[PDB]
Each structure stands twice: as structure tokens, then as C-alpha cells.
Amino acid sequence: MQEHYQPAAIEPAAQKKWDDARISNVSEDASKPKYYCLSMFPYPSGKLHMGHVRNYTIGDVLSRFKLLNGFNVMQPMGWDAFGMPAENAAMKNNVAPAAWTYDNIEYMKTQLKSLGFAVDWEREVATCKPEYYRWEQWLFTKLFEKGIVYRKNGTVNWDPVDQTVLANEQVIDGRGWRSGALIEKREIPMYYFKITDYAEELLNDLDKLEHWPEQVKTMQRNWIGKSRGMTVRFAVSDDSKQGLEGDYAKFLQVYTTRPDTLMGATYVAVAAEHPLATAAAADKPELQAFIAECKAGSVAEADMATMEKKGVPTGRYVVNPLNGDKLEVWIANYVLWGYGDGAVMAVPAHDERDFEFAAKYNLPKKQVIAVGDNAFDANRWQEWYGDKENGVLVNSGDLDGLDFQTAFDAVAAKLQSQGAGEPKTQYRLRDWGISRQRYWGCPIPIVHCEKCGNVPVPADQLPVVLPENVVPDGMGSPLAKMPEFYETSCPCCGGAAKRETDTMDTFIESSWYFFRYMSPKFSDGMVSAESAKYWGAVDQYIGGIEHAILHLLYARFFTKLMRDEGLVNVDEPFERLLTQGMVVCETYYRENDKGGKDWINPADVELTVSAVLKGLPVVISGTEKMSKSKNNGVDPQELINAYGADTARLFMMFAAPPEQSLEWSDSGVEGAHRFLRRLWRTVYEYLKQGGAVKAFAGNQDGLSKELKDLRHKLHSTTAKVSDDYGRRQQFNTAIAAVMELLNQYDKTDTGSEQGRAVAQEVLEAAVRLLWPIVPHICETLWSELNGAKLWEAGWPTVDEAALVKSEI
Ligand SMILES: [Mg+2]
Ligand SMILES: [Zn+2]
């Protein structure tokens, strides 16, 4: 054993030992309890970033911990390979997206290997290989013939200068983000998952996920947005019927979740596209401009609530079916066509959005709910105005004194008796649009035939292979310009036909990859029956916050679809969720000769407090998430090159709890490294003073007080570490506990025969308690202390007798 810790001299050997023993290559072995620990697989962008290293170290700790506790652990790794960055890199570097992607996979796989993650690499998948995406094409065709996938016209944002479609997040003030050209609203046929057929199941089955964070479930519930409400029809006044036809000339239909407040409605609001808006706008240019602006907006969903609410009166009136009030119709930008009837009633006194709308336009506010003796102020919103539980009806004639549910049913009865309304359930959930006008994604397995229509590709002819000899040029998406790809024959009649050229939303690949890991070479289905039955559901899922709502929702949807096809037996894919925190770092800049700032990467400055560009000073600025926005990313490879993998893993687990933001710290990295030196020196000094002995075990009566206190600390530490790994998932406090154990060890005389046995017991436990965090140095130190295989000695046991104190 060398005297000094040299991670370059031990980390390759340790990795080769694990690979040779194949501890991470797992099969469907019913002789051992399974554990499926899954970390969100990476986009092969070119090289790991610090977020990757944090995510997969957290996954590795949990995996290695459960391995030491006797579990058959599958910890798989793969590549979420489709998407825009490969296209972007192709347009910049004149290379093919596939070539760029596979070179990135090869480099990043090496980096992951160098960190010593206990990964079953025989289960590696790459979603851009046809051996993978053929199976989501297969699922598509099966759902398409059932109508769960369907074709329908939808509206997209066309950038005529870049010749491509943009999401609302890539549209700024109505113009494309990169071009600055005004976008054009185009209606084109696209494909959709009928996810709304599964809304009730996707909402109710959340109750099964006892170990999910409550706010993640809450966000799933809000996104599905089930409401139980009331359809209410407002007769159109005789003076307001010009230009209307059909049912729109008889009544205005709305949906409301507060029909108990129908006596307090003071006006109604319709979408820009509602026929009442069209008819009223016919001879009013101000309404035509307002309708045109609503149609031209590109507000993303995540920003819909923060959009300023605006309306225009129409001079058209409708009649409240309960009290006969004539109410004016307004056109408003927050009423969306397609959401229910595209029309709502407004009760400003008891709905805060209506309150602020009415207060802006000085529309009337009518109180119809009372909560105790609380004063109602028509000029100031109070939280109790919206209270649905403790309120009682007022100013409602026949309905006064009723609570929410009784007034709900009485209004239901009144309306139904008049033919003017009925109860109704609605969902905010929209169907899932999967068509993308992009090249580097999974082809959609549809052929368009003028005689046969939209025809699914037969299972025998899957995959529809995406050609990889393609370099996108930025003058439109390549597939629509490649007749050698889209020109084909109809699989139903043999006549001339054309393949669909749109590709699939890349969320599809990540909605089932965790099943594919169970049998990644299986050629007869998405996943083999034996492997799905054994592995079941993911026991632990570790990932980030970005896109989590949709990804979780989509993966739960796909599970229910795959279960209904007889491919899996679980209703839910993920039993536990750990969302890791972002990694943040300081930023640095120098001012421009053009009134702006040039952002400097931390690897290109030296800190004297103050900074200098590698030699004039730079400005040290604020701390924020590492990104290319302000060029403050720290390269994990330089951290590995300078200190080794264990230092990297230890710093990330020590610096903050996994869900907390982790602040980059040079001194913290160095502190992590010095601790590894300490751990190395402690074992080396123990073994230089007499060589290893048998670890103390059994009855400790007759041990000195100081050695009993060390064994108390020892088995108290083991209990704490076990609860931190297995229950709290708080690895930083577990590292500190082992540090406190080593401190007590340092202050304890262990030179006696019983002392050496306790010391051996202390060090044998500590190296095993830390093996999930820093396995290379711990594997190396364990073999100097004990001849058994560490993974067969297993997780350290708590000696409860070491914790019982001597009575008085
Ligand atoms: Mg349960
Ligand atoms: Zn045909």
C-alpha cells in the first residue's frame, strides 16, 4: 500500500475489478430481490455537464447502497438522442446529425465510465437507432387503428424566413426568435394522442403513489384540471340576433364551476372566434382589430395566467335564465376557443380574475355569497370572496341561505326544468400533439394514399427508417424535400403514395425507455413478457425539474397504454421520485465598447476577491445556474483530470442535499480531496502499526469505557447513514456522520489488543458506509483491511448492544 493517495493509480484498477466481476450486469434472477434505480438518461450533447455528474452520482449512491443490502440492482444507462441540437450542430458544422450524435455518445460514455457508475452497460439503448424507435412506431400504428391516435388540423407558427415551424416559446412579440420575421398562423393536419380518454385514470391513479412528493402530484392534478360544474344557456335577447345562425341565434352556452353564484353574474365573455364575436364585429372595426390581435398572439401555456386580461363590449345581450337579467356580451382575450363552449359568465364579486376585469372596466360587482359576519367591500378583493366551503348564499331570492352543494343542486334542478342547463364535467387537459416539422426524430409510420387515405405502415415493414445521410441546410426540413424517402407505394392498394414526412415529438422516446431497458435486444415486442414481469416498475427515479410535469404525465400515459396492450402489468411507472437541485456558479464579465457585457468562463480567470482575464481585471458578478447564457459552466472533465472521480463524486454529495441548489466551490472541492487523503492516511497508519486483525464482534462487556464509546459512535453512525441513504436520501449529513466517527476514532487510544479489534471494526465499517459515495478509494482500502469481497460482506449491521448504556 502506497503512503499517499493517488486516485489515478487506483480508479482504473477498481473499475476493472468491478467489470471483471460483472457486479452491475444483471439478469432476471428470481433468487434475489429486485431493485430498479433509474436516472434520467442524457441527451448526447457532446460532453457531460455538472448536472449530469450530480444526477448520476445520486443514482449511483442509491444503487450501490441497495447492492450492498443484497438487492439485484438494475441501474441502466442510455441516450435520448433525437432532437434539435444535432440539427443545429449540423447546420453550423456541415456534419450529419447522426454522425455528430454517435461521436457524442462515444465520448460521453467514456466519461461516465471514468466516474465508476455501477451501470449495466449491456442494457444501453440509443433512441435514434432503428432497433429502438421501430417499437414506438409499432405502438403508434396500434393506437392509430384504435383511434387513440388520430389526424386533425391544428394551428402552428410558420417562420417564413427560416422556413420552419416554431413553438410559442420561440416567438417574441409575434416574430421568430432567430430571424426576427413576423410569424404566420397556418392550419395543417397533425397527429394527436387522445390522452383525454385517460384523464380520469391519470388523475385517480395518483392516489396509489404514496411515496411521491405531494406537490408533484398536485402539479399533475392541476395540469389535468378536472372540474365538476354546470352548463348554463343564456337566451339571446331579441335585439341581439342579427348575423347569428343555428343554436348561436337562440342562446349563449357557457360552462361554470360556480353555478351557486349564477345570481351574481353581471356580464358574459366570449372567445375571439365565438360566433357572437363574429356577428358583433361585422360593422365594428374596433372589434375586428381586437379579434385580430387575439388570433395573432402566441402566449405559451406557462405564461397564460400572467397575460394582461383585455376585453371589448359588443353591444349584444343575453338573458340570465335564473333571474332574467339582461347581460352584455364582452369579447375577451382569456376565453379560449376549444376550451368548453368558448364562453364564460363573469361573477366579479366571487372570482378574482373577474374582480380585476370588472374593476378595470367599471363593470358591476354583485355579492351573492356571505361568509360569517365578514364585511364585503366592492373595491378590494378579499380571499373569502372565493370561499366555496364556508359561504352561504345571499341576494339570490329563492336560493338564500344555501351552502355550495345544496345551491349547486337546486340550480341544477331549476335549469334542467327550464331546459336551460345541466351538470357537466370538464378537464383542462388537451390532447397530446406529436407531429413535429423536424428531421432528426422518429418517422411517423403513415402513408398517404389518394384512394386509401392515411394508412398505417404494416408491422411487417417497420421500422420506417430515418435516412441518416442528411445534412440540414436551414431552408426547410429535409424530409419534405427528399422524394427518395417520401415517394412510395400504398401498403393497401399498391398505388403511388407518399410517406408522412413529419417526425414525432421527442417526448415519445422518453415516455417508455424505462421499459425498453428491461429487454433492450428483444426483437418481438417493445419489451419481453418475462422481463416486464420480473422488473415490474421503477423503484427509484432520479432527475431534474425541467419538463418534469409533461414527462411524468406522458410516461404514465404510455404505461397505461402499454398495460392495455398486454405488454406490462403495472399501472404506474415510477414508485419514488428524487428531483435533484440545479448546480450554480459565479459569473464574470467585462463591459463592451458597445454598452453591453462580455461574459467570461470561470476556467479563463484567476481569483486573487478579484479576477483577471488570462491579465486585466474582470468583474465578479452574480451566481446562477451553469449555462451558456452567461458562460459560467464548469467542465466536469477538468475536475476529474485534476482530482479524480471520487473527489468529484464526494464534493457533489457533500456540498448540499440532493434537492438543494449546489454552489460551485474551489475550496469545497479541495476540502473533499483532503478528506479522501485523510481516509487514506488513516488506513495506512493503522496498517503500518501492526497489520490487520479480526474486527471486534460480540459481547463488549469488559471493554474499556473509551472503547465502548467508540463502538457506540460506530453503530450510531451506521444507523444514521442507513437512515440517510435509505429513508431521508440526504447524503451530505451521512458524510458528516462518518467524519464525526473518524474524529472520535482519532481521539481514541486503540493500541491495545481490544483497541486494534475495535479500530479494525471502525475502519471496516467506514469504508463500507462510504463505498456508495466514493467506491474507488473504498474498494482499495477495503482490500487492504480484509480479504473478503466487499459486496459480499454487505452493508454494515447495527450492533444494538453497543447502544445500550451501562445502568447505575
Ligand atoms: Mg401501495
Ligand atoms: Zn392505397
Author numbering: 1 to 608, 616 to 621, 624 to 817
What does the publication say?
To correctly aminoacylate tRNALeu, leucyl-tRNA synthetase (LeuRS) catalyzes three reactions: activation of leucine by ATP to form leucyl-adenylate (Leu-AMP), transfer of this amino acid to tRNALeu and post-transfer editing of any mischarged product. Mechanistically similar to other adenylate-forming enzymes, the class Ia aminoacyl-tRNA synthetase (aaRS) LeuRS charges tRNALeu isoacceptors, which are essential substrates for protein translation. We have solved crystal structures for all enzymatic states of Neisseria gonorrhoeae LeuRS during Leu-AMP formation.
To capture the different enzymatic states of the first catalytic step of LeuRS, crystals of the N. gonorrhoeae apoenzyme were soaked with Leu, ATP, ATP and l-leucinol, ATP and Leu. As has been previously recognized, the active site of NgLeuRS is large (approximately 758 Å3 in the apo form), which is necessary for association of the various substrates. In the apo state, the synthetic site of NgLeuRS is fully open allowing the entry of all substrates. Intriguingly, careful examination of the different X-ray structures shows the presence of a peptide-plane flip between L550 and H551 in the NgLeuRS·ATP·leucinol complex, that is absent in the apo and the intermediate bound structures.
